[PDB]
């Protein structure tokens, strides 16, 4: 689906500086808008709309994959976590940026899938949700697939090969080191409870296995930076403390 061929190596470094935060993107070009819709409006504004970096996870030959939930992931991130927790409402878009660096000597391909309403493994259609609020919500450390989400079934009862129906990019080691996904707010309502319902599902699975020459780094790292876009919350409620 993502049959692109930017350049291959590295050309120019253009750093995104949104408020206090500062990413130095590989370039910046090769970004995918989900369904062709930029996030929009239906209060820390520019102060709260800044990319927060989650924890770095280790990609090794045996990795099955990883998954995250939005808003959930960024529930501990300063200004965004707060306005999220001190409001009954909240809707917001996201700029997902997944960086995966290596060399001219590694190989493989990661698929970064952004799935709306990504319910995970519990074939119990006679009842979704299932897994306790704490299990389904792993926050910033994220959850992992296994050969409890089954990788080839994208952990939801649907063969991986078709996951390309959801917006996505493929980080292919020989081409790009970054994937960029602008995801607008997707839900059945104008605005809803951020604490209870998870808007999107960031999925990253080994579409090709990792292979390094002779002896180098035994494993390589991947990073996810997520930025809230057009975030509003109603209504200035409690300020407990």
């Amino acid at each position: 689906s993502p049959n692109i061929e930017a350049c291959g190596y590295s050309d120019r470094v253009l750093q995104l500086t949104l408020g206090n935060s500062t990413i130095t993107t590989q370039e910046a070009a090769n970004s995918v808008v989900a369904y062709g819709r930029w996030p929009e409006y239906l209060e820390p504004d520019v102060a709260a709309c800044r990319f927060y970096t989650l924890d770095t996870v280790s990609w090794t030959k045996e990795s099955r994959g990883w998954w995250w939930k939005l808003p959930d992931a960024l529930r501990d991130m300063g200004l965004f976590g707060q306005n999220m927790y001190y409001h009954y409402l909240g809707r917001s878009g996201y700029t997902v940026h997944v960086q995966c660096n290596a060399s001219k000597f590694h190989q493989g391909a990661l698929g970064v899938f952004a799935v709306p309403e990504m319910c995970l493994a519990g074939d119990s259609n006679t009842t979704t949700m299932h897994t306790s609020y704490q299990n389904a919500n792993p926050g910033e450390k994220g959850g992992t697939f296994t050969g409890c989400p089954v990788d080839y079934l994208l952990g939801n009862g649907t063969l991986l090969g078709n996951a390309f129906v959801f917006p996505h990019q493929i980080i292919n080691l020989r081409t790009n080191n970054c994937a960029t996904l602008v995801l607008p707010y997707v839900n059945s309502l104008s605005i809803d409870s951020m604490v209870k319902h998870n808007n999107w599902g960031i999925a990253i699975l080994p579409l090709a296995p990792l292979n390094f020459a002779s002896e180098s780094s035994p494993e390589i790292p991947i990073t996810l930076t997520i930025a809230p876009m057009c975030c509003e919350f109603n209504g200035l409620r409690n300020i407990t403390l």
Binding site: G157, T158, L189
Partner: protein, 190 residues
């Protein structure tokens, strides 16, 4: 050229969604006790369900049609007059009927349809009764799904010496239907 493949034209079919079973005993046959209650869901059959599952969300004007068939059970030469049935659509989350006797069956607010047997099968339109902007095929967060109310059916005519078995077939034609985000189909059995 692609008209017969558009969303409206993909679902512009009436599909069986359930088969309610009622009866008219002259005695104590309380299992049907003349009435049957059915929770309106697409999830009971499979053909309509899978067709609707290629998507996550959808708004749809729902048009039901009721075919009623009757028959005598006991090998008797006993007779019966043409019977009348009552088919009620109880709007999403309202008092659920048990006994064929109780108050609920007087439905000041809920609709009701009397169907005389032997004529053209019954038919009603229910607008997008979603509580949300869209119906959620699959739902995430913290089944009940969305809910489309319930259907209750009883024989209105009174207890006839000759017991009569009936079956109300329900058909759901979603009309003026729109959908949203698309997920890969359910490969396996449900």
């Amino acid at each position: 050229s692609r008209s017969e493949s558009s969303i409206e034209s993909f679902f512009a079919r009436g599909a069986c969604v359930t088969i309610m079973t009622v009866d008219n005993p002259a005695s104590t046959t309380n299992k049907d006790k003349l009435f049957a209650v059915w929770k309106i869901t697409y999830k009971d059959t499979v053909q309509l369900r899978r067709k609707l599952e290629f998507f996550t969300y959808s708004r749809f004007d729902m048009e039901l049609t009721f075919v009623v068939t009757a028959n005598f059970t006991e090998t008797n030469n006993g007779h019966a007059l043409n019977q009348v049935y009552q088919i009620m659509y109880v709007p999403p989350g309202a008092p659920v009927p048990e006994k064929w006797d109780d108050y609920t069956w007087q439905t000041s607010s809920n609709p009701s349809i009397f169907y005389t047997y032997g004529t053209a099968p019954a038919r009603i339109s229910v607008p997008y009764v979603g509580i949300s902007n869209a119906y959620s095929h699959f739902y995430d967060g913290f089944a009940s799904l969305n809910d489309f109310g319930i259907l209750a059916v009883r024989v209105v005519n009174d207890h006839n010496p000759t017991k009569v078995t009936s079956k109300i077939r329900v058909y759901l034609k979603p009309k003026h239907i729109r959908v949203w985000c698309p997920r890969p189909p359910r490969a396996v059995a449900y």
